[PDB]
Swiss-Prot record:
Associated pathology: Hyper-IgE syndrome 6, autosomal dominant, with recurrent infections: An immunologic disorder characterized by severe allergic disease with onset in infancy. Common features are treatment-resistant atopic dermatitis, food allergies, asthma, eosinophilic gastrointestinal disease, and severe episodes of anaphylaxis. Half of the patients present with recurrent skin, respiratory, and viral infections. Clinical laboratory testing is notable for eosinophilia and markedly elevated serum IgE levels.
Coiled coil ranges: none
All residue ranges annotated as the SH2 domain in the record: 301-409
Entry similarity comment: Belongs to the transcription factor STAT family.
Recorded name of the encoding gene: STAT6
Protein name: Signal transducer and activator of transcription 6
Free-text description of this protein's post-translational modifications in UniProt: Tyrosine phosphorylated following stimulation by IL3/interleukin-3. Dephosphorylation on tyrosine residues by PTPN2 negatively regulates the IL4/interleukin-4 mediated signaling.
Function (record text): Carries out a dual function: signal transduction and activation of transcription. Involved in IL4/interleukin-4- and IL3/interleukin-3-mediated signaling.
Effect the entry attributes to changing A142V: Does not affect DNA-binding transcription factor activity; does not affect STAT6 phosphorylation
Recorded superkingdom: Eukaryota
Assembly and oligomerization: Forms a homodimer or a heterodimer with a related family member. Interacts with NCOA1 via its C-terminal LXXLL motif.
Protein's cellular compartments: Cytoplasm; Nucleus
Length: 409
């Protein structure tokens, strides 16, 4: 037989590869929710999808107008496969270009955006634009106002998107976007989980559950399952990214900071980072269990640091003037033998989002002792700068190590 159906299998394989390129784009977009690079456009991806449709076009006219003329092998058993290649590709093109706010207040106006990749090839000028409906569904309904926007095209933009500029209203519920279409096939697009806050108490547990979803999700997800015992290396990586992103700095967390954050989260005084690198970290350990002796979970404390550092310590963290994540065992280790007045800047343990000035003083007996000045929260730092306050304290002379106070600040 003529049957060179290996070019159909080539299209079947190239379509499978394009489907992964889209899958990967959605994961980069999901990681970007927890402040991450990504910044990838759907424009080159759309070009790859156009090429698949172009290959499907040539392959469809070759089958039907055959030379060898074979029946159900080069007709029914061959057209059914090519039909699937278009059916699956078209459904894997109705995406969410701009995601809705995952931390959503149940009244504020939120913007949304969906993009169809094969719109410039399937929706011409005389063809009517399909009305897209954005109905909110829960985690159960995921497994199958102002929600009506027509899918329009663009000549000086080369796209077929649909922006929903106006929209008003542990519970992961996402917005389902859908539209009617005919070559009479249907299109659907599900967004990333959204927790709806009422703005009465606090959104702390919503930000923590979104952070855990976006970072610790699989590409082959069943909306909306998340692994609940991730390794510490991945959590450190995520915490480092969320730090640099929320704080707005390029100077990130380093191995020593991580060791402290591990000693706090596990309530373990171990010193080897080996006995911490490959270790399980549950969602309970992260935002359920209250820290020993404290009235808050680990995420509540880390979020306070992000709040404080972003708000008033943005400059000093970047300047590498704040150690921040250091155990009292290590502060004594360095500062204790340095000359009097040598100070250091670290984060308050007992108080949520505070910065204490640890410094070396002379004890009652004369031997060096470690003194910690009362911590400054963002409210005290709004009244007076950290550098201004550090200047007001005459006992403070040099920031560790051996670096004049007035020179550093």
């Amino acid at each position: 037989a003529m049957l060179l159906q290996e070019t159909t299998g080539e299209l079947e394989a190239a379509k499978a590869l394009v489907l992964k390129r889209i899958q990967i784009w959605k994961r980069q977009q999901q990681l970007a929710g927890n402040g991450a690079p990504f910044e990838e456009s759907l424009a080159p991806l759309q070009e790859r999808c156009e090429s698949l449709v172009d290959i499907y076009s040539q392959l469809q006219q070759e089958v039907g107008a055959a030379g060898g003329e074979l029946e159900p092998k080069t007709r029914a058993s061959l057209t059914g496969r090519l039909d699937e290649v278009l059916r699956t590709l078209v459904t894997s093109c109705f995406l969410v270009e701009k995601q809705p706010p995952q931390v959503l207040k149940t009244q504020t106006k939120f913007q949304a955006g969906v993009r169809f990749l094969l719109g410039l090839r399937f929706l011409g000028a005389p063809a009517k634009p399909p009305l897209v409906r954005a109905d909110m569904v829960t985690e159960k309904q995921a497994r199958e106002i102002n929600n009506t926007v027509p899918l329009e095209n663009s000549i000086p933009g080369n796209c077929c998107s649909a922006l929903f500029k106006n929209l008003l209203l542990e519970e992961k519920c996402a917005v389902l976007f859908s539209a009617s279409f005919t070559l009479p096939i249907q299109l659907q697009a599900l967004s990333l989980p959204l927790v709806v806050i009422v703005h009465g108490n606090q959104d702390n547990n919503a930000k923590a559950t979104i952070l855990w979803d976006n970072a610790f999700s699989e590409m082959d997800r069943v909306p909306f399952v998340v692994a609940e015992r991730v390794p510490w290396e991945k959590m450190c990586e995520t915490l480092n990214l969320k730090f640099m992103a929320e704080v707005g700095t390029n100077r990130g967390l380093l191995p020593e900071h991580f060791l402290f954050l591990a000693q706090k989260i596990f309530n373990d005084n171990s010193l080897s980072m080996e006995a911490f690198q490959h270790r399980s970290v549950s969602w309970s350990q992260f935002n359920k269990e209250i820290l020993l002796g404290r009235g808050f979970t680990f995420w509540q404390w880390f979020d306070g640091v992000l709040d404080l550092t972003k708000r008033c310590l943005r400059s000093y963290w970047s300047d590498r003037l704040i150690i921040g994540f250091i155990s009292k065992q290590y502060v004594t280790s360095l500062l204790l033998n340095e000359p009097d007045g040598t100070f250091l800047l670290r984060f308050s343990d007992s108080e949520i989002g505070g910065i204490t000035i640890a410094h070396v003083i002379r004890g009652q007996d004369g031997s060096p002792q470690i003194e910690n000045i009362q911590p400054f929260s963002a409210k005290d730092l709004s009244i007076r700068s950290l550098g201004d306050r550090i200047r007001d304290l005459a006992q403070l002379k040099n920031l560790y190590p051996k670096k004049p106070k007035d020179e550093a600040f």
